[PDB]
Swiss-Prot record, chain C:
It is found in: Nucleus, Nucleolus. Belongs to the NRAP family. Interacts with snoRNA U3. Interacts with MPP10. Component of the ribosomal small subunit (SSU) processome composed of at least 40 protein subunits and snoRNA U3. Interacts with UBP10. This is U3 small nucleolar RNA-associated protein 22. Involved in nucleolar processing of pre-18S ribosomal RNA and ribosome assembly. It comes from the Eukaryota. Present with 3260 molecules/cell in log phase SD medium.
Swiss-Prot record, chain D:
GO terms for biological process: cytoplasmic translation; maturation of SSU-rRNA from tricistronic rRNA transcript (SSU-rRNA, 5.8S rRNA, LSU-rRNA). Present with 92400 molecules/cell in log phase SD medium. This is Small ribosomal subunit protein eS1A. Belongs to the eukaryotic ribosomal protein eS1 family. It comes from Saccharomyces cerevisiae (strain ATCC 204508 / S288c) (Baker's yeast).
From Swiss-Prot, chain E:
Required for 40S ribosome biogenesis. Involved in nucleolar processing of pre-18S ribosomal RNA and ribosome assembly. Essential for vegetative growth. The chain holds residues 38 to 212 of 316 of the full protein. One of its GO terms (biological process) is endonucleolytic cleavage in ITS1 to separate SSU-rRNA from 5.8S rRNA and LSU-rRNA from tricistronic rRNA transcript (SSU-rRNA, 5.8S rRNA, LSU-rRNA). The gene is KRR1. One of its GO terms (molecular function) is RNA binding. This is KRR1 small subunit processome component. The lineage of its organism: Eukaryota, Fungi, Dikarya, Ascomycota, Saccharomycotina. It is found in: Nucleus, Nucleolus. Component of the ribosomal small subunit (SSU) processome composed of at least 40 protein subunits and snoRNA U3. Interacts with snoRNA U3. Interacts with MPP10, KRI1 and with ribosomal proteins RPS1A, RPS4A, RPS4B, RPS8A, RPS8B, RPS11A, RPS11B, RPS13, RPS24, RPS25, RPL4A, RPL7B, RPL8, RPL23, RPL25 and RPL28.
Curated annotation (Swiss-Prot), chain F:
It comes from Saccharomyces cerevisiae (strain ATCC 204508 / S288c). The keyword Cytoplasm applies. One of its GO terms (biological process) is cytoplasmic translation. This is Small ribosomal subunit protein uS11A. GO terms for cellular component: 90S preribosome; cytosol; cytosolic small ribosomal subunit; nucleolus; nucleoplasm; small-subunit processome. GO terms for molecular function: mRNA binding; structural constituent of ribosome. N-terminally acetylated by acetyltransferase NatA. Component of the ribosome, a large ribonucleoprotein complex responsible for the synthesis of proteins in the cell. The small ribosomal subunit (SSU) binds messenger RNAs (mRNAs) and translates the encoded message by selecting cognate aminoacyl-transfer RNA (tRNA) molecules. The large subunit (LSU) contains the ribosomal catalytic site termed the peptidyl transferase center (PTC), which catalyzes the formation of peptide bonds, thereby polymerizing the amino acids delivered by tRNAs into a polypeptide chain. Keywords: Acetylation, Cytoplasm, Nucleus, Ribonucleoprotein, Ribosomal protein, Ribosome biogenesis, rRNA processing.
Length: 18, 44, 487, 148, 175, 109
RNA sequence: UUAAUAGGGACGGUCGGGGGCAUCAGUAUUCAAUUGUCAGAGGUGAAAUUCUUGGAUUUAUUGAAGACUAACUACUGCGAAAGCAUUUGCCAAGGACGUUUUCAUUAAUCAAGAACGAAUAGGGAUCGGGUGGUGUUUUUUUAAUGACCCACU
């Protein structure tokens, strides 16, 4: 649970910015 | 007065200038299509 | 539009041509208003002048509610009194210009004047090819709604007192000079009083009429159509009112103590079809009660009885084409379906009533997620199902109607499409548990939906009512488009 | 209710407006809380124009220590705004036959609650009033769709 | 059928918590239903199917409105009688200044509650001023006089014309 | 089961008003008020005269055919005394004792 | 030569029934019209004044007007006071808090004169801000704003 999915969707936002 | 009907005329020309111009070019093209030639007129 | 200066009183479409157009606009350049104000100016463009003519023809009546006064030798003055005839009256020459026009030709001319005026008021789409480059009078089946083929074998003149139901004596030769003028006027009156508000407009056509004949003859001689008069047959062309055409009861005068004039014209006009009825509001009226048909409208029967009663016993009215177009409709397995009119949608209404009986029961069930919407998107809800909805006829593919189902906006919807559609599935399992729990008259099961590519987990809820109809339920959420555009 | 078309001791009627009791709006306004109201005017599918109302009251929670628990007056600028788009997405589609049917189980009030929860939750919220002003035309034929 | 309900502040809460039994005793004499909500802080009276005369629920409304503004209960139970008329006077919407509101409230009650009690002798009424309200029970013309004097006291009209005026009117009725 | 209307008692000061109307409300029936049946000008809102006028209104009600009714009580309100009169109870008591039917009444102050 | 718990200035998230301008909702009152209806209606301690069968009162409908934001509304918040409570938008402005930003005593108090106005140190509560959280909740939605509560200032 949470922390890992927040890391993955954190990487998804990393793809959202650039 | 003349200024009031002048404003009505300019406002109405503003209201119909679009289809007046495009429909006017349609008038030029269609009257270019349906025009009689003069040599047939002298012929009759 | 087939409009010309030719005599429309002979059963043609005309009376108003280019010459009457130029007299009309030339009269508009010398007034035209009610208080003799000028409608058109000499400094206008041809769109402004022509638009003023179409606006005058669309807005100002010259037949019933007014006429136009003008001077050929002084301002044009519109008068609000009509002579029950298309009236365009010169004072200098005392000539009514529109004498060649009939009443229906002027009402149809005003109708095309209003259609054309609305097309000139369109500022989005182009109507140039519509107004000036489209032929509507090439085919009457496109121009008109109905066309009745009327055969009239009238023979000679001395046969007319035996073949015409009316009397063509001296006075009809005085006012109505020919046979075809009193014929078109008479059939126009019988058909106009016969239908009334079931239609909107009508033209009567003498098919096969001629205006040319050689120098070796005195007049046009003919023998075709069973008579020696200048037509083959008579076509009845009809512009149909959609709101009042297929009603069961042709309305007549109200029944009172003393018989009025209109009740004598009514009962004289219908005879055995003239009757009395208490309406729904309790009014006792003279009327006519008819029967609808899925093969033909009532209008053919009214024109048939009116022309075979009041014009000629030898008339042969035929329109089998519209009978074919009604007959190629798939006749649904319903009681009195053959005696059901084409505009009736009562089976769709019964599916709507059974759907609302379903809607009240399902829409008030208790759930962990409250239903946002139960929205029908079926073809039978937009009345386009190719087969009309028959109870218990499940073999048709338009039987199960699709219904959109929406729950409350809640974060209980997962972030993966298979578990999302399986959550919709388990929600439909709770719906089926309540439905089979307490509404066992409604039958139900589950099916797959694989018409959407690569989403094999869509499960539709199929419900069969004791009214004999079936629905498939599908669920739409707000997480859907996020996952699809996400994908 | 609004009276439209009769047939011989058989008179249909149309919706005219939603009303609320006296006592309860005199009852629901408690001391030491925050009163929030809203309205908008909008055109529907057929061009019925209605001014809807919306009233909103704040609740207290479990284990609250203080006695008042008001809002912060910038939440209220947000919550009045948040409600406003929820009102417009509901309306202008599939009029009173479905719209009044949405009003009866107060699904829309729960939809308000589904969005308001991220700011400050609330209590009883109702719409409490609706009115009609701009019905276009009679339309007896579509009025007979509700009739059987 | 009919459901009348009102609220209460939380300092009255313990008192009504102690006497709600006698509330539903004087209330059960008239065959009415009632519930007490703690988390709302409300009292709700509702009619039963076994009621004799329904109109008393209006009185019951006033009665729980009497408990809405902290009226003592043996004084409050007079409203169920026939010859009783009551009045809650809301005095909030007159002055924006809280200072002048204290000036006119303290001016109304007078020093030591004398002048207020004077009204309770001049109108022969029970008057219990609760914050932004003024409680009045008793005769009907007495309620006309109390509402007249209070609604003239929230303005700049000095009440000595009312004490002296009803002082005249009491002695003229003696004669 | 019954025919229904609204009675709409307007209990004001110095007189109390009643007018039993139809369910639409625009059509009134048998209005006659309390001050009519007394000539003293002081007891126009008394409960004793309120019982007399409401008995007469209940008399003319069943004489037409109306058998059941609701009521909407109404004090003066607005900027006024906001409180129902004495005979507003006595109007409601006299018609209920007459034998009419009552259900779900409300306030329109 | 420092950068005062002297003063002043800058920025950030803000805060306010703070001001100026604009827009809008609500019912009430009065008046006019239409409908049902038809001898009384206002008023006082009663008297008296007032209205009325061209129908008074009331009912239901519509328009108009000016006025205001009823419960919540507090020993709360703002303004130097005079004063400031409908939605929404614009326009500057203000303080506090935060700050490892800037000048450097530029300061404090007051006749004359100006404008506006009739003319000692704890206890508890609460407002605004900030910070910490072996904290909760909204979270079957990945996250996360927000509220809540403990503690500090």
């Amino acid at each position: 649970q949470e922390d890992v999915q927040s890391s993955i969707v954190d990487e998804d936002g990393f793809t959202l910015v650039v | 007065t003349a200024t009031e009907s002048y404003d009505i005329h300019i406002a109405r020309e503003t209201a119909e200038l679009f289809k007046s111009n495009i429909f006017k070019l349609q008038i030029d093209e269609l009257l270019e299509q349906v025009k009689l030639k003069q040599k047939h007129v002298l012929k009759v | 539009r087939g409009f010309s200066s030719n005599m429309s009183h002979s059963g043609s479409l005309g009376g108003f041509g280019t010459f009457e157009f130029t007299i009309l606009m030339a009269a508009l350049l010398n007034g035209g208003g009610i208080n003799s104000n000028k409608i058109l100016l000499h400094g206008f463009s041809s769109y402004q002048l022509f638009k003023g003519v179409i606006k005058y023809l669309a807005t100002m009546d010259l037949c019933h509610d007014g006429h136009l006064q003008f001077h050929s030798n002084p301002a044009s003055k519109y008068i609000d009194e009509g002579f029950q005839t298309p009236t365009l009256f010169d004072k200098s020459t005392k000539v009514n210009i529109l004498t060649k026009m009939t009443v229906s030709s002027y009402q149809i001319l005003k109708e095309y004047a209003g259609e054309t005026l609305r097309m000139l008021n369109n500022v989005v789409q182009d109507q140039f090819s519509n107004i000036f480059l489209t032929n509507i009078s090439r085919f009457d089946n496109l121009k008109y709604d109905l066309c009745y083929d009327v055969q009239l074998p009238l023979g000679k003149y001395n046969n007319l007192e035996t073949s015409l139901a009316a009397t063509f004596g001296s006075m009809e030769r005085v006012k109505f000079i020919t046979l075809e003028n009193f014929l078109a006027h008479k059939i126009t009156n019988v058909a106009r009083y016969a239908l009334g508000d079931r239609i909107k407009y009508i033209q009567i056509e003498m098919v096969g009429q001629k205006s040319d004949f050689p120098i070796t003859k005195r007049k046009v001689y003919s023998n075709t159509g069973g008579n020696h008069f200048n037509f083959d047959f008579v076509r009845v062309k009809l512009i149909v009112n959609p709101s009042e055409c297929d009603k069961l009861v042709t309305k007549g005068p109200a029944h009172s103590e003393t018989m009025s004039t209109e009740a004598a014209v009514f009962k004289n006009f219908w005879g055995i079809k003239s009757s009395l009825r208490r309406f729904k509001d309790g009014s006792i009226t003279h009327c006519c009660v008819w029967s609808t048909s899925s093969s033909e409208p009532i209008i053919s029967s009214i024109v048939n009885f009116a022309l075979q009663k009041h014009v000629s016993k030898k008339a042969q009215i035929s329109n089998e084409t519209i009978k074919k177009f009604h007959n190629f409709l798939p006749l649904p397995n319903l009681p009195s379906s053959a005696k059901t009119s084409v505009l009736n949608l009562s089976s769709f209404f019964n599916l709507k009533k059974s759907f609302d009986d379903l809607y009240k029961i399902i829409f008030q069930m208790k759930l962990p997620l409250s239903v946002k919407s139960i929205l029908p998107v079926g073809s039978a809800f937009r009345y386009t199902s190719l087969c009309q909805p028959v109870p218990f006829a499940y073999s048709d593919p338009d039987f199960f109607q699709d219904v959109i189902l929406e729950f409350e906006t809640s974060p209980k919807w997962p972030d993966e499409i298979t578990s999302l559609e399986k959550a919709k599935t388990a929600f439909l399992l709770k719906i089926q548990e309540e439905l089979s729990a307490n509404s066992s008259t409604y039958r139900s099961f589950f099916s797959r939906d694989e018409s959407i590519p690569y989403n094999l987990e869509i499960v539709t809820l199929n419900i069969l009512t004791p009214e004999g109809y079936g629905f498939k339920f599908r669920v739409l959420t707000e997480r859907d488009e996020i996952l699809y555009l996400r994908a | 209710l609004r009276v439209d078309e009769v047939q011989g001791k058989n008179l249909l009627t149309n919706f005219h407006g939603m009303d609320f009791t006296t006592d309860k709006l005199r009852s629901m306004v408690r001391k030491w809380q925050t009163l929030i109201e809203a309205n908008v005017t909008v055109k529907t599918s057929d061009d019925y124009v209605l001014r809807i109302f919306a009233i909103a009251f704040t609740r207290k929670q479990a284990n609250q220590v203080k006695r008042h628990s008001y809002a912060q007056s910038s939440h209220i600028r947000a919550i009045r705004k948040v409600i406003s788009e929820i009102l417009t997405k509901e309306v202008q589609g599939s009029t009173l036959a479905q719209l009044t049917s949405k009003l009866i189980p107060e699904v829309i009030n729960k939809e308000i609650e589904n969005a308001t929860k991220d700011i400050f939750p609330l209590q009883n919220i109702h719409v409490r009033k609706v009115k009609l002003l701009k019905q276009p035309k009679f339309d007896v034929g579509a009025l007979m769709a509700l009739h059987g | 059928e009919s459901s009348f309900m009102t609220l209460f502040p939380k300092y009255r809460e313990s008192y009504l918590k102690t006497i709600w039994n006698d509330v539903t005793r004087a209330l059960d004499k008239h065959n009415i239903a009632c519930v007490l909500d703690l988390v709302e802080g409300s009292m709700t009276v509702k009619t039963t199917r076994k009621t004799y005369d329904p109109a008393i629920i209006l009185k019951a409304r006033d009665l729980i409105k009497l408990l809405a503004r902290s009226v003592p209960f043996p004084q409050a139970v007079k409203i169920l009688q026939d010859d009783m008329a009551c009045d809650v006077i809301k005095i909030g919407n007159f002055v924006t200044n809280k200072e002048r509101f204290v000036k006119r409230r303290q001016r109304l009650v007078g020093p030591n509650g004398n002048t207020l009690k004077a009204l309770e002798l001049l109108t022969k009424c029970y008057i219990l001023v609760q914050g932004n309200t003024v409680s009045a029970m008793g005769p009907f013309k007495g309620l006309k006089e109390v509402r007249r004097v209070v609604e003239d006291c929230m303005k700049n009209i000095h009440p000595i014309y009312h004490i002296k005026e009803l002082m005249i009117k009491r002695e003229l009725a003696k004669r | 089961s019954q025919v229904f209307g609204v009675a709409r008692i307007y209990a004001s000061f110095n007189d109390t008003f009643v007018h039993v109307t139809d369910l639409s409300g625009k059509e009134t029936i048998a209005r006659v008020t309390g001050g009519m049946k007394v000539k003293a000008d002081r007891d126009e809102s008394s409960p004793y005269a309120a019982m007399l006028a409401a008995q007469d209104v209940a008399a003319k009600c069943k004489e037409v055919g109306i058998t059941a009714v609701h009521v909407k009580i109404r004090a003066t309100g607005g900027t006024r005394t906001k409180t129902p009169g004495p005979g507003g109870q006595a109007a409601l008591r006299a018609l209920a004792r007459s034998g009419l039917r009552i259900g779900r009444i409300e306030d329109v102050t």
